[PDB]
């Protein structure tokens, strides 16, 4: 207000149009709260227009922070893939889907290796002593293949019978609006928030 | 999409600041040159800031054109909320 | 003892966005930020009031700390 | 069996995969050509100098096999160099991997992209000078920490950033992966060292007993213990279980700028700005020797692969070699031993760099010393 | 058991999943996870909550058994709950293990 | 130091979690990583 | 000389950009401290869209910033982005060519030598050859 | 007896599939569209009366314990089943079936 | 400069002010344009050499003496 061309004037006027493009503290416990901190300085009584001025000052502190975390909680709700003015450049996540398929294949390979090792443990024309894990476990493998058949006929018997985006603000959006502003950038409330 | 249209036009546009110099100070802060047009929009935004300060300073000089003095930058940045400092120690 | 009742804070969000829901962690941190603001502002305003040799804590004292350290400029 | 060894299920260490078991097969082929160094067969030092380096080099790391060299620089970049004749390739994009099949023997070879193949990959994303650099033992997963308060996990298969670990608000002066590659420790200006796990956005252990900046953070070879040197002239061992400080090593006159462990796990060499390399016992918690040849800040230490030689590199542009067998020939209740004043007999050699501070020291698995430092004419 | 998808809850779920697959908000290779979690949920739920029992006396026509799946077709069966009688003409009973 | 030692003992009491044996590239949840499809504008 | 030049080439281009915008305004001959002031606000402005648009994209789990990350970055600096298409189409504008690069003359001479003694088996072939 | 189980299991699968979809990257309004149109289809089938309404043969699917066969009679030990009879639906957890072939 | 709001530049270094004690304190605005820009130096490269060959330091030009 002291600066006519002030730079935080144009911020929160263009921030509101960015969110459009997608407190009133209790007077009775606050008046006891000001007076107890006033005992440490000798401020024994307070002016009657102050306890509602601090409540208007706490409102414009949090409304400047609720508006700030709302324009970064809607920053994540901009889906580029519905628009076709944008083009995909580098997806690490589909590479991760490929990794998940590769890991399933590796687990199958490891199971096959273990079966081969069990078979080797007693390789003979007839089953051999304790290591004859081939005689019983291989029959179980056949039983497991029969069990798979179930996961495929249940998909067949039942077929034969048949025949306004909501924005949620995380703690990241509050932390992101704390390390940027000058107050609460090096503070114990942001430092503890990294562990909550 | 006026700005999306402008950024699409920014290919074939050469800004006053080079992209080897705007891209150097962007790489210093982690911003890497994926797209030249984005570097050019950042360069133009910086240019507009400096140019607006300069034009306000010129209105002050014309009121008191020609030489730009620290006593012209002082009321020009005061409406921006920026208190510029004299050297005073050299 | 709590000065912000956790429901008027939800009306501070409904005025900005009619479709927005904070998390419980976010609400509790916002309440802590409010409590901390009240404490810092009152302590410094009281330092200005002792400086003005007063036992009254008038707004001039609260208004000066907002303009110089927080740049709030709340109309008085 | 070692009675001083922890159980395998004490710290939940990750599994050993078949590609990680394939690494140790070619690692013991390098151990076949490994020379016994001793005080007679002094090793050859191959200095990998950074020539231009007008952005200030602040962090070096080499992989366990001498294949990659990372460089952390003051222009907020990490730069990976291949030193073997094999260019750095990224893996193919997700469209190219969807058309190929898995289960093939080649698989990894099939995935590599040859369109992207350089001898140098630059990594952007830190907003500040990168101070720590740490490779993972599987040669993926570069780690970097910087002035902006974040630790970053760069992939070496996609050559992008994966995670940014924001726990410090302050300059993270060092980071290191575990020698098994899952956990990592990062020490910063906020006088703690955090233990991370590459799976959680929040740390697991906070080592918060130092009174100044945690300059160094080193894992034990069994990764159950973390040594954190600091600027309050103390070195502290921290148990990964319970986060307790189990050893406190005092006796340095300046901030500790280098730590290394013996390959036995019995000893710990620390260097600081006083030019002193102090050799500590870990079981007895007693310093066992003092090496006082260096003049300026000792910024890099490493033992040999056998443990025969400790190599020291400092800002006096020298790579000193110390006899790390004659320094540990004797193994209380007075809590101290009479240190021998034997530095002159433990110096096997001093080699001076051309105006080049020795930032890193590395030992090849065939016992060849590698060193990296930006050449600063000054 | 992927058996319960041909029920009325499975019908409503599968057709609402196709309704959201038509508006491209959800994707294939994700609805597989939706059905898997739903099937595990009803496997947990259906053997936990109800605790009821119904008895009947039947006159079987045809029956079939394959891959541990029984399927019967009964004719003119009456059901029984206590003071609740259900007369019906032709039933198909499917049952897995 | 009295603040760092309180958040340490609150954090160091929690035991270390076990590791899944073949989970893949071990990463945080995808809203905590930097791995998104990472779009760009079409040149026209 | 070269380390000074690494920083100075990129600062001197910023100073020439400042001098050119001042000339476009109407100023001929400015004070010296007023030019190093304004080119310090110019470097601090490019470095602030560097740090904040990287922060806004990485908050949304991405690594390189799009247009929607800068039009929220410039809003949080109070820029009024809509006036920028009119500023780009001036008739008074200049173009400062980028600082000359010594990389174009990257390598004067590269050669090899013979008679170097062989490598011992603890040194692989990719390390440099033993000298004369 | 049927809408209680339907409400409990639909909120169970919703509160389980929340993390499944947000680990597969989609908005919570998409989850809401899933549940909303899913209760819309329970309205549209028009068989059980419940909540979102106020706002083809007879098949019994189940599991078995044992099927036992005498010369002319069958004994079914059925369990945990959802019956659809006369249009309406019922649930059971045990069933003894006497069947003359 | 010092920005009270702090939003245009938030903890962003502008590299200081290139000012001197023996400066002229007034320059012509076309003198700064017409001077040639300094040459951007070479990028960082990795060269390897030998500090020690089995204990002995070679007399190559990458070594001091």
**Closest by alpha carbon to C2, among A50, A52, A33, A45?**
A33
- Enclosing H/E stretch for D349: strand D347-352
Q: Do D127 and B30 touch (CB under 8 A)?
A: yes
CB contact, 8 Å: B24 with chain A? no
CB contact, 8 Å: E31 with chain H? no
D354, D366, D378: best mutation site toward chain I, by most I Cβ within 10 Å?
A: D354
- Residue E92 CB partners (closer than 8 Å, separation 6+): A161, E71, E72, E73, H57, H58, H59, H60
CA D146/CA D72 separation, integer angstroms: 9
D267-294 as b/e: b if 16+ CB within 10 A: bbbbbbbbbbbbbbbbeeebbbbbbebb
CA F33/CA H25 separation, integer angstroms: 13
CATH code of H5's domain = 1.10.287.100
CA D255/CA D269 separation, integer angstroms: 14
Helix (H, G, I), strand (E, B) or coil at A114: helix
Where do the domains of chain E lie? Answer: 1-51, 52-97
Tell me E84's DSSP state: B
Q: Is D242 left (phi over 0), alpha (psi -120 to 50) or beta?
A: left
- Enclosing H/E stretch for D165: strand D161-166
CA D186/CA D216 separation, integer angstroms: 8
Tokens representing residue C63 in the block: 């208004």
DSSP string for D274-339: TS-EEEEESSS--EEEEE----S-EEEEEE-SSSSEEEEEETTSEEEEEETTGGG-----SS----
Q: Do F40 and A87 touch (CB under 8 A)?
A: yes
Window 4-33 of H: residues touching E by CB (8 A cutoff) are: 4-6, 8-10, 12-13, 16-17, 20-21, 24, 26-27, 30, 33
Q: Do F40 and B35 touch (CB under 8 A)?
A: yes
Closest G-chain CA to D31? G122
Report how far apart the first and last C-alpha atoms of chain H are (Å, whole number): 33
CA D264/CA D261 separation, integer angstroms: 8
Tokens representing residue G54 in the block: 């990287």
* Out of I9, I16, I40, closest to residue G48 by CB: I9
CA B26 to chain CA centroid, Å, is: 14
Helix (H, G, I), strand (E, B) or coil at C19: coil
- Asked if residue F36 lies in contact with residue A93, where contact means CB atoms within 8 angstroms, the answer is yes
- Residue A160 CB partners (closer than 8 Å, separation 6+): none
**Closest by alpha carbon to C14, among A164, A57, A63, A171?**
A63
Tell me A168's DSSP state: E
Q: How far is I7 from chain G (nearest CA, A)?
A: 5
**Helix, strand, coil percent content, chain F, rounded in steps of 5:** 20, 10, 75
- Asked if residue B33 lies in contact with residue B39, where contact means CB atoms within 8 angstroms, the answer is yes
CA H95/CA H76 separation, integer angstroms: 7
Way the structure was solved: cryo-EM
CA I62/CA I65 separation, integer angstroms: 9
Pairing of strands D234-239, D245-250: antiparallel
Distance (Å) of CA I35 to CA A133, B20, B68, G38, I30: 86, 19, 20, 19, 9
CA A9/CA C73 separation, integer angstroms: 12
Can you name the residues that pair with D106 across neighbouring β-strands? none
Pairing of strands E55-66, H95-100: parallel
Where do the domains of chain C lie? Answer: 5-76
CA B34/CA D222 separation, integer angstroms: 42
Helix (H, G, I), strand (E, B) or coil at I46: strand
- Top CATH class, E52-97: mainly beta
CA A87/CA A76 separation, integer angstroms: 18
Tokens representing residue A106 in the block: 């590796």
Contacts of H64 in chain E (CB under 8 A): 70, 95-97
CA G52/CA D337 separation, integer angstroms: 56
What is the dihedral angle through the alpha carbons of F17, F18, F20, F24, rounded to the nearest 10 degrees? 60
CA G43/CA G37 separation, integer angstroms: 10
D267-272 β-sheet, strand order: D256-261, D267-272, D277-281, D287-291
Kindly report the length of chain A.
Answer: 196
CB contact, 8 Å: G63 with chain F? yes
**Closest by alpha carbon to C20, among H2, A187, H42, A168?**
A168
* Out of E3, E67, E68, closest to residue A158 by CB: E3
Burial class (CB in 10 A: 0-12, 13-18, 19+), A54: buried
- Residue B36 CB partners (closer than 8 Å, separation 6+): B10, B11, B19
Report how far apart the first and last C-alpha atoms of chain B are (Å, whole number): 51
Radius of gyration of chain G (CA): 24
Q: How far is D74 from chain B (nearest CA, A)?
A: 9
**Closest by alpha carbon to H81, among H99, H96, H71, H101?**
H96
**Residue H13 domain boundaries:** 1-43
Closest F-chain CA to B33? F40
Burial class (CB in 10 A: 0-12, 13-18, 19+), D361: buried
CA A119/CA A142 separation, integer angstroms: 15
Tokens representing residue D325 in the block: 């067998």
Q: Do G49 and B42 touch (CB under 8 A)?
A: yes
Tell me F18's DSSP state: P
DSSP string for B22-40: HHHHHHTTT---S-HHHHH
**Closest by alpha carbon to A22, among A74, A79, A64?**
A74
Q: How far is E48 from chain H (nearest CA, A)?
A: 9
H69 is in an annotated binding site: yes
**Closest by alpha carbon to B23, among B43, B4, B49, B47?**
B43
CA G82/CA I49 separation, integer angstroms: 56
H77 is in an annotated binding site: no
Identify each DSSP E strand in D51-111 by its residue range. Answer: 57-62, 68-73, 77-82, 88-91
- Asked if residue D53 lies in contact with residue D79, where contact means CB atoms within 8 angstroms, the answer is no
- Residue A157 CB partners (closer than 8 Å, separation 6+): E3, E69, E71, E94
CA I26/CA G67 separation, integer angstroms: 40
Tell me A64's DSSP state: H
CA E57/CA H96 separation, integer angstroms: 8
CA D276/CA D296 separation, integer angstroms: 9
CA B42/CA G84 separation, integer angstroms: 11
* One-letter-per-residue 3-state SS of chain G: CHHHHHHHHHHHHHHHHHHHHHHHHCCCCCCHHHHHHHHHHHHHHHHHHHHHHHHHHHHCCCCCCCCCCCCCCCHHHCCCHHHHHHHHCCCCCCCCCCCCECCCCCCCCCCCCCCCCCCCCCCCCCCCCCCC
Contacts of D244 in chain F (CB under 8 A): 12
- Top CATH class, E1-51: mainly alpha
CB contact, 8 Å: F32 with chain D? yes
Tell me I41's DSSP state: -
């Amino acid at each position: 207000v002291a600066s006519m061309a002030g730079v935080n004037l144009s911020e929160e006027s263009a921030r509101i149009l960015a969110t459009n493009s997608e407190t009133f503290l209790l007077q009775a416990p606050l008046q006891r709260r000001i007076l107890e901190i006033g005992k440490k300085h000798g401020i024994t009584e307070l002016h009657p227009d102050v306890v509602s001025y601090v409540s208007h000052a706490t409102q414009q502190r949090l409304q400047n922070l609720v508006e700030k975390i709302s324009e970064t909680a809607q920053q994540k709700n901009f889906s580029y893939k519905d628009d076709d003015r944008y083009e995909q450049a580098s997806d690490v996540r589909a590479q991760l889907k490929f990794f998940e398929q590769l890991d399933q294949i590796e687990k199958q390979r490891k199971d096959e290796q273990e079966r081969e090792i069990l078979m080797r443990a007693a390789k003979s024309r007839s089953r051999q002593e304790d290591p004859e894990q081939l005689r019983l476990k291989q029959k179980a493998k056949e039983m497991q293949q029969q069990e798979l058949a179930q996961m495929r006929q249940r998909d067949a018997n039942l077929t034969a019978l048949a025949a306004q985006r909501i924005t949620r603000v995380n703690l990241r959006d509050l932390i992101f609006c704390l390390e940027n502003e000058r107050e609460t950038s090096h503070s114990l409330l942001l430092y503890k928030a990294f562990l909550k | 999409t006026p700005l999306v249209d402008f950024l699409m036009q920014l290919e074939d546009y050469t800004p006053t600041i080079p992209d080897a110099v705007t891209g150097y100070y962007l790489n210093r802060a982690g911003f890497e040159a994926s797209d030249p047009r984005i570097i050019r929009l950042i360069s133009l935004a910086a240019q507009k800031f400096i140019s607006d300060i300069a034009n306000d300073a010129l209105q002050h000089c014309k009121m008191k054109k020609y030489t730009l003095t620290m006593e012209d930058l002082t009321p020009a940045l005061s409406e921006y909320g920026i208190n510029v400092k004299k050297p005073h120690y050299f | 003892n709590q000065v912000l009742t956790k429901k008027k804070l939800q009306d501070l969000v409904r005025e900005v966005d009619p479709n927005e829901q904070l998390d419980e962690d976010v609400e509790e941190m916002l309440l802590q930020i409010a409590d901390d603001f009240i404490e810092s502002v009152v302590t410094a305003a009281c330092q200005l009031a002792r400086h003005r040799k007063s036992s009254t804590l008038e707004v001039k004292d609260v208004q000066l700390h907002l303009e110089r350290q927080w740049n709030m400029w709340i109309p008085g | 069996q070692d009675p001083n060894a922890p159980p395998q299920n004490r710290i939940p260490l990750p599994e050993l995969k078949d590609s990680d078991k394939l690494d140790k097969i070619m690692n013991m082929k390098e151990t076949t050509k490994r020379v016994r160094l001793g005080p007679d067969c002094l090793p050859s030092i191959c200095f990998y100098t950074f020539l231009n380096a007008y952005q200030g080099l602040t962090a070096v790391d080499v992989t366990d096999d001498s294949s990659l060299i990372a460089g952390g620089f003051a222009d907020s970049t990490v730069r990976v160099w291949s030193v073997t004749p094999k260019k750095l390739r990224s893996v193919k994009q997700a469209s190219d991997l969807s058309l190929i099949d898995k289960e093939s023997d080649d698989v990894l070879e099939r995935i590599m992209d040859e369109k992207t193949a350089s001898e140098l990959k630059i990594l952007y994303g830190h907003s500040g000078p990168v101070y720590g650099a740490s490779f993972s033992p599987d040669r993926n997963y570069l780690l970097s920490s910087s002035e902006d308060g974040t630790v970053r996990l760069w992939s070496l298969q996609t050559f992008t950033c994966l995670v940014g670990y924001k726990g410090h608000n302050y300059p993270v002066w060092d980071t290191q992966f575990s020698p098994y590659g899952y956990y990592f420790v990062s020490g910063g200006h906020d006088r703690v060292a955090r233990l991370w796990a590459t799976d959680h956005y929040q740390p697991l252990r906070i080592f918060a007993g130092h009174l100044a900046d945690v300059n160094c953070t080193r894992f034990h070879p069994n990764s159950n213990y973390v040594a954190t040197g600091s600027a309050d002239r103390t070195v502290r061992l921290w148990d990964v279980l319970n986060g307790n400080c189990v050893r406190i090593f005092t006796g340095h006159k300046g901030p500790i700028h280098s730590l290394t462990f013996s390959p036995n796990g019995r000893f710990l060499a620390t260097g600081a700005t006083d030019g002193r390399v102090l050799l500590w016992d870990i079981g007895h918690g007693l310093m066992v020797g003092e090496l006082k040849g260096h003049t300026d800040t000792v910024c890099s230490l490493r033992f040999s692969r056998d443990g025969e030689i400790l190599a020291s590199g400092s800002m006096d542009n020298t790579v000193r070699l110390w006899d790390a067998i004659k320094a540990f020939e004797d193994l209380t209740a007075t809590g101290h031993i009479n240190l021998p004043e034997n530095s002159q007999e433990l110096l096997l050699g001093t080699y001076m760099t051309k105006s080049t501070p020795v930032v890193h020291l590395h030992f090849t698995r065939r016992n060849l010393v590698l060193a990296a430092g930006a050449y600063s004419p000054q | 058991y992927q058996l319960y998808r041909n029920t009325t809850l499975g019908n409503s779920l599968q057709e609402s999943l196709d309704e959201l697959i038509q508006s491209q908000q959800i994707t294939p290779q994700l609805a597989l996870q939706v059905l898997l979690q739903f099937d595990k949920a009803i496997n947990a739920a259906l053997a936990q909550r109800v605790r009821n029992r119904v008895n009947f006396r039947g006159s079987l026509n045809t029956y079939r058994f394959c891959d541990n799946v029984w399927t019967f077709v009964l004719n003119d069966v009456e059901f029984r709950e206590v003071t609740e009688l259900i007369k019906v003409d032709k039933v198909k009973i499917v049952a897995c293990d | 130091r009295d603040f760092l030692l309180d958040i340490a003992r609150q954090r160091n009491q929690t035991p270390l979690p076990l590791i899944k044996p073949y989970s893949g590239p071990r990463l945080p949840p995808d809203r905590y990583c930097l791995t998104a499809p990472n779009y760009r504008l079409k040149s026209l | 000389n070269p380390a000074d030049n690494y920083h100075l080439a990129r600062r001197r281009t910023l100073q020439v950009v400042v001098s050119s915008l001042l000339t476009e305004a109407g100023f001929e001959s400015a004070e010296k401290a007023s030019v190093e002031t304004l080119t310090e606000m110019l470097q601090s402005y490019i470095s602030e869209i560097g740090r904040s648009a990287k922060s806004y994209c990485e908050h949304t789990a991405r690594t390189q910033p799009t247009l929607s990350d800068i039009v929220v970055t410039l809003v949080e600096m109070g820029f009024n982005v809509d006036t920028l298409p009119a500023y780009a189409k001036r008739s008074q504008r200049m173009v400062i060519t980028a600082p000359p690069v010594t990389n174009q003359p990257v390598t004067p001479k590269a050669l090899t030598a013979g008679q170097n003694r062989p490598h011992p088996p603890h040194i692989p072939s990719h390390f440099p050859e033993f000298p004369d | 007896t049927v809408p209680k189980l339907y409400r409990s299991v639909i909120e169970d699968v919703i509160n389980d599939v929340r993390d499944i979809f947000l680990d597969d990257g989609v908005d919570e309004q998409v989850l809401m569209e899933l549940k909303t149109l899913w209760e819309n289809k329970l309205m549209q089938s028009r068989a059980v009366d419940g909540f979102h309404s106020e706002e083809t043969e007879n098949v019994v699917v189940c599991q078995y314990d044992k099927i036992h066969r005498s010369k002319n009679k069958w004994k079914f030990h059925l369990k945990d089943g959802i019956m659809n009879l006369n249009g309406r639906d019922y649930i059971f957890s045990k069933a003894i079936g006497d069947a003359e072939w | 400069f010092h920005a009270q709001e702090f939003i245009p530049f938030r903890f962003a270094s502008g590299g200081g002010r290139e000012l001197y004690f023996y400066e002229e304190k007034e320059v012509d605005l076309s003198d700064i344009i017409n001077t040639p820009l300094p040459r951007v130096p070479l990028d960082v490269c990795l060269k390897a050499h030998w500090l020690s060959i089995e204990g002995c330091q070679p007399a190559i030009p990458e070594n001091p003496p």
